[PDB]
Design a protein around this ligand. Structure first.
Ligand SMILES: *[C@@H]1O[C@H](CO[C@@H]2O[C@@H](C)[C@@H](O)[C@@H](O)[C@@H]2O)[C@@H](O[C@H]2O[C@H](CO)[C@@H](O)[C@H](O)[C@H]2NC(C)=O)[C@H](O)[C@H]1NC(C)=O
Ligand code: NAG
Ligand code: NAG
Ligand code: NAG
Lengths: 9, 589
């Protein structure tokens, strides 16, 4: 799995 | 060397490449370990440039070894440490708040704290850096999430500011990891897996050392000079897999295969190749050609030329001609020969400018055979004799130099010593009768005793002495390496106890090779008291706090401090140093 980044909001 | 930095200037051109660092301080480290970088310019977070320029670390080279400075806002300049003499460290304990470092995110998991996320990055076979979202992190499903990352280079591909998060690197390069190293090298074996890079290497040891300091190398395959295909001799192949282990072991002939040792980084030579390669010529770009009497002299001239990465000396050929050869100082874009030609008469090696990036306790020590029991100066240069001034100055116990300002010894050694000030550490000693009132000695500034220590038989029997004045290393006084946490499962089989027998002292230093014996085997002999994993035994003439030193793969390791022995039959018991690595490091930096 590749995970997405953390949210910029 | 211009060691500190230069706000707020910028070098002009000469760029090799551009990378991303959370700071100039780190930029300067990347520049040091890069094989061509001599200087660099970092760009800090600032009003003056778009976000997309922040954290830009530009590595550079110049033939004159410097560049034109120019004033510029929020730029920081510096030089690599290649020019410098003191030790050089990759370790970076920095946590960076509101900084998010980009890379291939391969693991998402929940973690107590940024700390415990760091422990996870460090303990993982792929992890370069992490980002950890804190419990004040707006998005409720992202709080407490520890994201693990890697890239090609070990540095992030991008850096961005992002509130309520913290990033940091793997502390593998401080000797903090628990990941086991595989020291086993497999002959006649090739691996198949993603080839992430490749170099030419004169042998499979250089190949493995390079694999170890290549951020993305987990294992490697080396094709020897005797390999069938002409085009691939001395080709060293740097591999990786997602499993992280090699999927397959194919048999073959004249290849050799093994693993990164990045976990065991201290305690193993890595950046330092001091062998000479006979009738071998290393191809690269020529930086100079000078006259010289020997290879040794060549190597020194290379070492003293900061752009030099390797050399070839062609001597007075045969035995005929003036004993003056040609020293070709060479260089490449990656610190390796572009090609390695056998059979052309040259003698080749590498620069030693490299060698101070290695742990001081990894130098060789100049041997002899065979016995036994007479030691001599130079032989056990980490051994110290630790003296007490009262009632009258006498050998209280043994200990071991492990740091510039550090001795490792037994806690039980300081039963009723009220004060550091009654203690004398003498190094370089052989005869005890050689110590006189004029003899030079180190004062102890402080005594750190494992707090959970009580009875020697109970365990936790370990003390650090911080010395008052640092030790200037020499053939007579040199540290010994701590075992690596990743060497836990290693089987030492060249072990030696040293000391003066302290009870009734002996004049000259004693040396006795002995054998470890398993805990179980020990437990069975020591009826009453338990024997924790935090001890280790041996047996089949050293003193308290004295070293149980084991030689593995050419490096000495301090495996045990002697604590309670009934032995020289019955086995001795020892503090199991490996188990107290975390502790020693915490206590010492
Ligand atoms: C993300 O990591 C999880 C934590 O396990 C550690 O993660 C890395 C440091 C890696 O070295 C791994 O081997 C470590 O053990 C991992 O899950 C493991 O632990 C969790 C509970 O914390 C548990 O849910 C899981 O069953 C455990 N076992 C294994 C070996 O992973 C998790 O799987 C990993 N994500 C993956 C592989 O997709
Ligand atoms: C150690 O002990 C005695 C000193 O009385 C001496 O005869 C012996 O040679 C000494 N060794 C060295 C190397 O000084
Ligand atoms: C360290 O190296 C040698 C030790 O013999 C000495 O010549 C030198 O002066 C020492 N000290 C320093 C601070 O350089
Ligand atoms: C940057 O350059 C000058 C030298 O030319 C230096 O003295 C000063 O700190 C900076 N310049 C100005 C104009 O302040």
């Amino acid at each position: 799995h590749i995970y997405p980044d953390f949210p910029t909001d | 060397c211009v060691t500190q930095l230069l706000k707020d200037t910028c070098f002009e051109g000469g760029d090799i490449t551009t990378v991303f660092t959370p700071s100039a301080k780190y930029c300067q480290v990347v520049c040091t370990y890069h094989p061509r970088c001599l200087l660099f310019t970092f760009t800090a977070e600032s009003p003056s440039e778009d976000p997309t320029r922040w954290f830009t670390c530009v590595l550079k080279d110049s033939v004159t070894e410097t560049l034109p400075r120019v004033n510029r806002t929020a730029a920081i300049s510096g030089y690599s440490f290649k020019q410098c003499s003191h030790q050089i460290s990759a370790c970076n304990k920095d946590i960076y708040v509101d900084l998010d470092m980009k890379g291939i995110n391969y693991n998402s998991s929940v973690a107590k704290s940024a700390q415990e996320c760091q422990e996870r990055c460090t303990d993982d076979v792929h992890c370069h850096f992490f980002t950890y979202a804190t419990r004040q992190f707006p998005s409720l499903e992202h709080r407490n999430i520890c994201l693990l990352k890697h890239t090609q280079t070990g540095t992030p591909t991008r850096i961005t500011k992002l509130d309520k998060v913290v990033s940091g690197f793997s502390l593998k390069s401080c000797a903090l990891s628990n990941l086991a190293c595989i020291r086993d090298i497999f002959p006649n074996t090739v691996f198949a897996d993603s080839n992430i890079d490749s170099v030419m290497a004169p042998d499979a040891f250089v190949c493995g050392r390079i694999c170890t300091h290549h951020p993305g190398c987990l294992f490697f395959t080396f094709f020897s000079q005797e390999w069938p295909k002409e085009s691939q001799r001395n080709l060293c192949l740097l591999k990786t897999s997602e499993s992280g282990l090699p999927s397959t072991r194919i048999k073959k002939s004249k290849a050799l295969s093994g693993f990164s040792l990045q976990s065991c980084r201290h305690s193993i030579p890595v950046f330092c190749h001091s062998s000479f390669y006979h009738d071998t010529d290393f191809l690269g770009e020529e930086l100079d050609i000078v006259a010289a009497k020997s290879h040794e002299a060549c190597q020194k001239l290379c070492t003293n030329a900061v752009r030099c990465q390797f050399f070839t000396y062609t001597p007075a050929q045969a035995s005929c001609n003036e004993g003056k050869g040609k020293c070709y100082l060479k260089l490449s874009s990656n610190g390796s020969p572009t090609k390695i030609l056998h059979g052309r008469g040259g003698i080749s090696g590498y620069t030693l400018r490299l060698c101070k990036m290695d742990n001081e306790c990894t130098t060789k020590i100049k041997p002899r055979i065979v016995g036994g029991t007479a030691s001599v100066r130079g032989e056990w240069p980490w051994q110290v004799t630790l003296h007490t001034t009262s009632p009258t100055q006498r050998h209280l116990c043994g200990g071991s130099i492990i740091g510039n300002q550090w001795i490792l010894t037994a806690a039980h050694c300081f039963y009723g010593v009220e004060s550091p000030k009654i203690l004398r550490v003498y190094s370089g000693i052989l005869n005890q009768s050689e110590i006189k009132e004029d003899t030079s000695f180190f004062g102890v500034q402080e005594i750190i005793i494992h707090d959970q220590y009580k009875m020697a038989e109970s365990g936790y029997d370990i003390a650090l002495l911080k010395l008052e004045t640092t030790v200037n290393y020499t053939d007579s006084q040199r540290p010994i390496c701590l075992p690596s946490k990743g060497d836990r499962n290693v089987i030492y089989t060249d072990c030696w106890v040293t000391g003066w027998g302290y009870d009734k002292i002996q004049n000259t230093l004693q040396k006795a090779k002995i054998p470890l014996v398993t805990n179980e085997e020990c437990q069975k002999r020591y009826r009453g008291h338990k024997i924790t994993h935090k001890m280790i035994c041996a047996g089949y003439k050293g003193d308290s706090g004295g070293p149980l030193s084991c030689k593995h793969n050419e490096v000495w390791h301090l495996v045990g401090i002697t604590s309670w022995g009934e032995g020289c039959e019955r086995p001795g018991v020892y503090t199991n140093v490996v188990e107290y690595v975390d502790w020693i490091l915490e206590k010492t930096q």
